[PDB]
């Protein structure tokens, strides 16, 4: 059973267990169960649960409620969640969520990344790199972007953050990143050369 480890405490009303149970369901792909548990946690003021609910509202950028994601993510940040800061930043770069504020996104992410050895720093540095790579905040700064992706990958898997960025450019994210084959190939090349073999494979595929 997914999230068996959290179930008893969650049912007992433990806010944190409710959150970790929700997160387990997100990973298992049951977003309805994820929502149910994250709502229970959010009722008790949990910021990470509010962040998770925000993420669920933009999980599909074609069928999203970017505006409510923003309100949830603001509440998450106010509740003290670094995960909240990351989701809020992801909203604030997106034209669908309201007026964009990329500068604010960057500060939110720099806060979430301030403990550079932590889990929050993984996603925070990935989004910081994508922002600098994207050219939505002045001219592209691919060297700076590479530094952020290296930081993210060093906490996770080498070359992974770069691969994720490559795929973001390949696929696009409506309201934020236009699909761009040139940028996709740039970052998949970096991923490959950092030693992430999936990067090499997708580079080859998109090239041929």
PDB file of C-alpha atoms in Angstrom:
ATOM      1  CA  UNK A   1       0.000   0.000   0.000  1.00  0.00           C
ATOM      2  CA  UNK A   2       1.420   3.451  -0.954  1.00  0.00           C
ATOM      3  CA  UNK A   3       2.028   5.614   2.133  1.00  0.00           C
ATOM      4  CA  UNK A   4       1.285   2.745   4.588  1.00  0.00           C
ATOM      5  CA  UNK A   5       3.929   4.324   6.834  1.00  0.00           C
ATOM      6  CA  UNK A   6       1.860   7.535   7.262  1.00  0.00           C
ATOM      7  CA  UNK A   7      -1.661   6.151   7.394  1.00  0.00           C
ATOM      8  CA  UNK A   8      -2.242   5.631  11.139  1.00  0.00           C
ATOM      9  CA  UNK A   9      -0.852   9.036  12.230  1.00  0.00           C
ATOM     10  CA  UNK A  10      -2.733  10.758   9.330  1.00  0.00           C
ATOM     11  CA  UNK A  11      -6.010   9.147  10.414  1.00  0.00           C
ATOM     12  CA  UNK A  12      -5.233  10.194  14.004  1.00  0.00           C
ATOM     13  CA  UNK A  13      -5.112  13.829  12.773  1.00  0.00           C
ATOM     14  CA  UNK A  14      -1.334  14.372  12.662  1.00  0.00           C
ATOM     15  CA  UNK A  15      -0.839  17.308  10.285  1.00  0.00           C
ATOM     16  CA  UNK A  16       2.664  16.276   9.139  1.00  0.00           C
ATOM     17  CA  UNK A  17       1.700  12.652   8.529  1.00  0.00           C
ATOM     18  CA  UNK A  18      -1.273  13.933   6.475  1.00  0.00           C
ATOM     19  CA  UNK A  19       1.168  15.942   4.387  1.00  0.00           C
ATOM     20  CA  UNK A  20       3.633  13.043   3.803  1.00  0.00           C
ATOM     21  CA  UNK A  21       0.695  10.736   2.937  1.00  0.00           C
ATOM     22  CA  UNK A  22      -0.538  13.304   0.410  1.00  0.00           C
ATOM     23  CA  UNK A  23       2.955  13.546  -1.115  1.00  0.00           C
ATOM     24  CA  UNK A  24       3.070   9.719  -1.420  1.00  0.00           C
ATOM     25  CA  UNK A  25      -0.170   9.773  -3.395  1.00  0.00           C
ATOM     26  CA  UNK A  26       1.209  12.482  -5.717  1.00  0.00           C
ATOM     27  CA  UNK A  27       4.134  10.174  -6.524  1.00  0.00           C
ATOM     28  CA  UNK A  28       1.792   7.164  -6.991  1.00  0.00           C
ATOM     29  CA  UNK A  29      -0.327   9.249  -9.370  1.00  0.00           C
ATOM     30  CA  UNK A  30      -3.547   9.384  -7.294  1.00  0.00           C
ATOM     31  CA  UNK A  31      -4.046  13.124  -7.251  1.00  0.00           C
ATOM     32  CA  UNK A  32      -7.526  12.859  -5.719  1.00  0.00           C
ATOM     33  CA  UNK A  33      -6.207  11.076  -2.615  1.00  0.00           C
ATOM     34  CA  UNK A  34      -3.265  13.495  -2.532  1.00  0.00           C
ATOM     35  CA  UNK A  35      -5.704  16.415  -2.524  1.00  0.00           C
ATOM     36  CA  UNK A  36      -7.866  14.878   0.232  1.00  0.00           C
ATOM     37  CA  UNK A  37      -4.957  14.449   2.647  1.00  0.00           C
ATOM     38  CA  UNK A  38      -3.227  17.746   1.771  1.00  0.00           C
ATOM     39  CA  UNK A  39      -6.534  19.547   2.445  1.00  0.00           C
ATOM     40  CA  UNK A  40      -6.691  17.959   5.900  1.00  0.00           C
ATOM     41  CA  UNK A  41      -3.154  19.142   6.635  1.00  0.00           C
ATOM     42  CA  UNK A  42      -3.766  22.593   5.166  1.00  0.00           C
ATOM     43  CA  UNK A  43      -6.820  23.000   7.472  1.00  0.00           C
ATOM     44  CA  UNK A  44      -4.311  22.750  10.349  1.00  0.00           C
ATOM     45  CA  UNK A  45      -2.119  25.469   8.859  1.00  0.00           C
ATOM     46  CA  UNK A  46       0.499  23.286   7.179  1.00  0.00           C
ATOM     47  CA  UNK A  47       2.481  25.305   4.644  1.00  0.00           C
ATOM     48  CA  UNK A  48       3.962  22.325   2.794  1.00  0.00           C
ATOM     49  CA  UNK A  49       0.400  20.932   2.330  1.00  0.00           C
ATOM     50  CA  UNK A  50      -0.730  24.341   0.978  1.00  0.00           C
ATOM     51  CA  UNK A  51       2.241  24.202  -1.449  1.00  0.00           C
ATOM     52  CA  UNK A  52       1.266  20.713  -2.557  1.00  0.00           C
ATOM     53  CA  UNK A  53      -2.324  21.895  -3.204  1.00  0.00           C
ATOM     54  CA  UNK A  54      -0.913  24.794  -5.243  1.00  0.00           C
ATOM     55  CA  UNK A  55       1.220  22.353  -7.312  1.00  0.00           C
ATOM     56  CA  UNK A  56      -1.866  20.182  -7.977  1.00  0.00           C
ATOM     57  CA  UNK A  57      -3.645  23.197  -9.475  1.00  0.00           C
ATOM     58  CA  UNK A  58      -0.854  23.660 -12.116  1.00  0.00           C
ATOM     59  CA  UNK A  59       0.115  20.012 -12.635  1.00  0.00           C
ATOM     60  CA  UNK A  60      -1.348  20.435 -16.124  1.00  0.00           C
ATOM     61  CA  UNK A  61      -0.421  23.938 -17.514  1.00  0.00           C
ATOM     62  CA  UNK A  62      -3.159  23.486 -20.192  1.00  0.00           C
ATOM     63  CA  UNK A  63      -5.913  22.699 -17.587  1.00  0.00           C
ATOM     64  CA  UNK A  64      -4.665  24.695 -14.648  1.00  0.00           C
ATOM     65  CA  UNK A  65      -6.046  27.109 -12.137  1.00  0.00           C
ATOM     66  CA  UNK A  66      -2.945  29.287 -11.985  1.00  0.00           C
ATOM     67  CA  UNK A  67      -4.739  32.017 -10.030  1.00  0.00           C
ATOM     68  CA  UNK A  68      -5.815  29.739  -7.170  1.00  0.00           C
ATOM     69  CA  UNK A  69      -2.340  28.101  -7.205  1.00  0.00           C
ATOM     70  CA  UNK A  70      -1.005  31.571  -6.543  1.00  0.00           C
ATOM     71  CA  UNK A  71      -3.318  32.175  -3.585  1.00  0.00           C
ATOM     72  CA  UNK A  72      -2.474  28.741  -2.084  1.00  0.00           C
ATOM     73  CA  UNK A  73       1.248  29.284  -2.615  1.00  0.00           C
ATOM     74  CA  UNK A  74       1.089  32.740  -0.938  1.00  0.00           C
ATOM     75  CA  UNK A  75      -0.575  31.126   2.077  1.00  0.00           C
ATOM     76  CA  UNK A  76       2.135  28.385   2.023  1.00  0.00           C
ATOM     77  CA  UNK A  77       4.901  30.999   2.054  1.00  0.00           C
ATOM     78  CA  UNK A  78       3.180  32.915   4.889  1.00  0.00           C
ATOM     79  CA  UNK A  79       2.944  29.588   6.833  1.00  0.00           C
ATOM     80  CA  UNK A  80       6.766  29.249   6.547  1.00  0.00           C
ATOM     81  CA  UNK A  81       7.156  26.708   3.700  1.00  0.00           C
ATOM     82  CA  UNK A  82      10.155  26.688   1.429  1.00  0.00           C
ATOM     83  CA  UNK A  83       8.260  24.333  -0.898  1.00  0.00           C
ATOM     84  CA  UNK A  84       5.673  27.136  -0.915  1.00  0.00           C
ATOM     85  CA  UNK A  85       8.322  29.621  -2.075  1.00  0.00           C
ATOM     86  CA  UNK A  86       9.276  27.336  -4.945  1.00  0.00           C
ATOM     87  CA  UNK A  87       5.640  26.875  -6.150  1.00  0.00           C
ATOM     88  CA  UNK A  88       4.954  30.582  -5.754  1.00  0.00           C
ATOM     89  CA  UNK A  89       8.003  31.333  -7.915  1.00  0.00           C
ATOM     90  CA  UNK A  90       6.753  28.820 -10.535  1.00  0.00           C
ATOM     91  CA  UNK A  91       3.397  30.764 -10.615  1.00  0.00           C
ATOM     92  CA  UNK A  92       4.957  34.235 -10.657  1.00  0.00           C
ATOM     93  CA  UNK A  93       6.878  33.423 -13.883  1.00  0.00           C
ATOM     94  CA  UNK A  94       3.676  32.349 -15.611  1.00  0.00           C
ATOM     95  CA  UNK A  95       1.446  34.798 -17.474  1.00  0.00           C
ATOM     96  CA  UNK A  96      -1.606  32.618 -16.635  1.00  0.00           C
ATOM     97  CA  UNK A  97      -1.315  33.246 -12.893  1.00  0.00           C
ATOM     98  CA  UNK A  98      -1.635  36.985 -12.913  1.00  0.00           C
ATOM     99  CA  UNK A  99       0.875  39.764 -13.731  1.00  0.00           C
ATOM    100  CA  UNK A 100       4.357  38.155 -13.760  1.00  0.00           C
ATOM    101  CA  UNK A 101       7.086  39.043 -11.252  1.00  0.00           C
ATOM    102  CA  UNK A 102      10.257  37.197 -12.219  1.00  0.00           C
ATOM    103  CA  UNK A 103      12.399  39.276  -9.863  1.00  0.00           C
ATOM    104  CA  UNK A 104      10.282  38.265  -6.941  1.00  0.00           C
ATOM    105  CA  UNK A 105      10.396  34.614  -8.077  1.00  0.00           C
ATOM    106  CA  UNK A 106      14.208  34.809  -8.009  1.00  0.00           C
ATOM    107  CA  UNK A 107      14.280  36.039  -4.375  1.00  0.00           C
ATOM    108  CA  UNK A 108      11.777  33.438  -3.280  1.00  0.00           C
ATOM    109  CA  UNK A 109      13.937  30.711  -4.873  1.00  0.00           C
ATOM    110  CA  UNK A 110      17.179  32.106  -3.382  1.00  0.00           C
ATOM    111  CA  UNK A 111      15.517  31.837   0.042  1.00  0.00           C
ATOM    112  CA  UNK A 112      14.372  28.290  -0.584  1.00  0.00           C
ATOM    113  CA  UNK A 113      17.934  27.426  -1.697  1.00  0.00           C
ATOM    114  CA  UNK A 114      19.703  29.173   1.223  1.00  0.00           C
ATOM    115  CA  UNK A 115      20.491  25.822   2.938  1.00  0.00           C
ATOM    116  CA  UNK A 116      22.388  24.498  -0.074  1.00  0.00           C
ATOM    117  CA  UNK A 117      22.555  20.902   1.291  1.00  0.00           C
ATOM    118  CA  UNK A 118      18.749  20.551   1.687  1.00  0.00           C
ATOM    119  CA  UNK A 119      15.902  19.021  -0.282  1.00  0.00           C
ATOM    120  CA  UNK A 120      14.309  22.466  -0.978  1.00  0.00           C
ATOM    121  CA  UNK A 121      17.537  23.541  -2.632  1.00  0.00           C
ATOM    122  CA  UNK A 122      17.146  20.853  -5.312  1.00  0.00           C
ATOM    123  CA  UNK A 123      13.946  22.250  -6.870  1.00  0.00           C
ATOM    124  CA  UNK A 124      14.818  25.852  -6.046  1.00  0.00           C
ATOM    125  CA  UNK A 125      18.122  25.727  -7.948  1.00  0.00           C
ATOM    126  CA  UNK A 126      16.466  23.886 -10.873  1.00  0.00           C
ATOM    127  CA  UNK A 127      13.938  26.690 -11.308  1.00  0.00           C
ATOM    128  CA  UNK A 128      16.575  29.411 -10.832  1.00  0.00           C
ATOM    129  CA  UNK A 129      18.610  27.783 -13.621  1.00  0.00           C
ATOM    130  CA  UNK A 130      15.577  27.554 -15.912  1.00  0.00           C
ATOM    131  CA  UNK A 131      14.764  31.222 -15.304  1.00  0.00           C
ATOM    132  CA  UNK A 132      18.299  32.278 -16.302  1.00  0.00           C
ATOM    133  CA  UNK A 133      18.267  29.881 -19.310  1.00  0.00           C
ATOM    134  CA  UNK A 134      14.843  30.988 -20.531  1.00  0.00           C
ATOM    135  CA  UNK A 135      15.469  34.630 -21.407  1.00  0.00           C
ATOM    136  CA  UNK A 136      12.200  35.696 -19.648  1.00  0.00           C
ATOM    137  CA  UNK A 137      14.380  37.813 -17.250  1.00  0.00           C
ATOM    138  CA  UNK A 138      16.592  39.787 -19.620  1.00  0.00           C
ATOM    139  CA  UNK A 139      19.049  38.103 -21.957  1.00  0.00           C
ATOM    140  CA  UNK A 140      19.747  34.389 -21.435  1.00  0.00           C
ATOM    141  CA  UNK A 141      22.635  33.738 -19.038  1.00  0.00           C
ATOM    142  CA  UNK A 142      23.473  30.133 -19.817  1.00  0.00           C
ATOM    143  CA  UNK A 143      26.672  30.190 -17.741  1.00  0.00           C
ATOM    144  CA  UNK A 144      24.777  31.305 -14.638  1.00  0.00           C
ATOM    145  CA  UNK A 145      22.014  28.792 -15.413  1.00  0.00           C
ATOM    146  CA  UNK A 146      24.642  26.030 -15.590  1.00  0.00           C
ATOM    147  CA  UNK A 147      25.896  26.920 -12.095  1.00  0.00           C
ATOM    148  CA  UNK A 148      22.393  26.560 -10.657  1.00  0.00           C
ATOM    149  CA  UNK A 149      21.759  23.287 -12.467  1.00  0.00           C
ATOM    150  CA  UNK A 150      25.096  21.934 -11.198  1.00  0.00           C
ATOM    151  CA  UNK A 151      24.114  22.830  -7.627  1.00  0.00           C
ATOM    152  CA  UNK A 152      20.738  21.080  -8.047  1.00  0.00           C
ATOM    153  CA  UNK A 153      22.312  17.995  -9.669  1.00  0.00           C
ATOM    154  CA  UNK A 154      25.029  17.785  -7.011  1.00  0.00           C
ATOM    155  CA  UNK A 155      22.260  17.256  -4.391  1.00  0.00           C
ATOM    156  CA  UNK A 156      20.423  14.751  -6.610  1.00  0.00           C
ATOM    157  CA  UNK A 157      22.019  13.072  -9.686  1.00  0.00           C
ATOM    158  CA  UNK A 158      24.813  14.613 -11.758  1.00  0.00           C
ATOM    159  CA  UNK A 159      23.435  15.973 -15.048  1.00  0.00           C
ATOM    160  CA  UNK A 160      19.802  15.517 -13.967  1.00  0.00           C
ATOM    161  CA  UNK A 161      18.819  19.181 -13.500  1.00  0.00           C
ATOM    162  CA  UNK A 162      20.261  19.893 -16.937  1.00  0.00           C
ATOM    163  CA  UNK A 163      18.279  17.032 -18.458  1.00  0.00           C
ATOM    164  CA  UNK A 164      15.056  18.351 -16.822  1.00  0.00           C
ATOM    165  CA  UNK A 165      15.786  21.790 -18.283  1.00  0.00           C
ATOM    166  CA  UNK A 166      16.368  20.277 -21.709  1.00  0.00           C
ATOM    167  CA  UNK A 167      13.025  18.497 -21.548  1.00  0.00           C
ATOM    168  CA  UNK A 168      11.291  21.705 -20.336  1.00  0.00           C
ATOM    169  CA  UNK A 169      12.581  23.466 -23.435  1.00  0.00           C
ATOM    170  CA  UNK A 170      11.562  20.539 -25.673  1.00  0.00           C
ATOM    171  CA  UNK A 171       7.990  20.362 -24.286  1.00  0.00           C
ATOM    172  CA  UNK A 172       7.469  23.968 -23.202  1.00  0.00           C
ATOM    173  CA  UNK A 173       5.330  25.121 -20.287  1.00  0.00           C
ATOM    174  CA  UNK A 174       2.359  27.199 -21.375  1.00  0.00           C
ATOM    175  CA  UNK A 175       2.577  30.750 -20.006  1.00  0.00           C
ATOM    176  CA  UNK A 176       6.300  30.450 -19.148  1.00  0.00           C
ATOM    177  CA  UNK A 177       8.554  28.543 -21.626  1.00  0.00           C
ATOM    178  CA  UNK A 178       7.902  28.415 -25.407  1.00  0.00           C
ATOM    179  CA  UNK A 179       9.165  25.119 -26.900  1.00  0.00           C
ATOM    180  CA  UNK A 180      12.696  25.724 -28.237  1.00  0.00           C
ATOM    181  CA  UNK A 181      14.609  22.884 -29.941  1.00  0.00           C
ATOM    182  CA  UNK A 182      17.956  24.768 -29.859  1.00  0.00           C
ATOM    183  CA  UNK A 183      17.767  25.287 -26.093  1.00  0.00           C
ATOM    184  CA  UNK A 184      16.550  21.707 -25.587  1.00  0.00           C
ATOM    185  CA  UNK A 185      19.649  20.397 -27.435  1.00  0.00           C
ATOM    186  CA  UNK A 186      21.990  22.781 -25.575  1.00  0.00           C
ATOM    187  CA  UNK A 187      20.881  21.510 -22.151  1.00  0.00           C
ATOM    188  CA  UNK A 188      20.626  17.831 -23.130  1.00  0.00           C
ATOM    189  CA  UNK A 189      24.213  18.146 -24.447  1.00  0.00           C
ATOM    190  CA  UNK A 190      25.279  19.563 -21.075  1.00  0.00           C
ATOM    191  CA  UNK A 191      23.428  16.749 -19.322  1.00  0.00           C
ATOM    192  CA  UNK A 192      25.184  14.146 -21.449  1.00  0.00           C
ATOM    193  CA  UNK A 193      28.633  15.676 -20.848  1.00  0.00           C
ATOM    194  CA  UNK A 194      27.975  15.791 -17.087  1.00  0.00           C
ATOM    195  CA  UNK A 195      27.453  12.007 -17.317  1.00  0.00           C
ATOM    196  CA  UNK A 196      23.629  11.570 -17.447  1.00  0.00           C
ATOM    197  CA  UNK A 197      23.131   8.938 -20.151  1.00  0.00           C
ATOM    198  CA  UNK A 198      19.410   9.721 -20.677  1.00  0.00           C
ATOM    199  CA  UNK A 199      20.619  13.167 -21.715  1.00  0.00           C
ATOM    200  CA  UNK A 200      22.826  11.681 -24.410  1.00  0.00           C
ATOM    201  CA  UNK A 201      19.935   9.483 -25.659  1.00  0.00           C
ATOM    202  CA  UNK A 202      17.431  12.377 -25.954  1.00  0.00           C
ATOM    203  CA  UNK A 203      20.081  14.613 -27.518  1.00  0.00           C
ATOM    204  CA  UNK A 204      20.639  11.917 -30.181  1.00  0.00           C
ATOM    205  CA  UNK A 205      16.898  11.380 -30.636  1.00  0.00           C
ATOM    206  CA  UNK A 206      16.012  15.088 -31.057  1.00  0.00           C
ATOM    207  CA  UNK A 207      19.040  15.563 -33.342  1.00  0.00           C
ATOM    208  CA  UNK A 208      18.016  12.623 -35.656  1.00  0.00           C
TER     209      UNK A 208
END
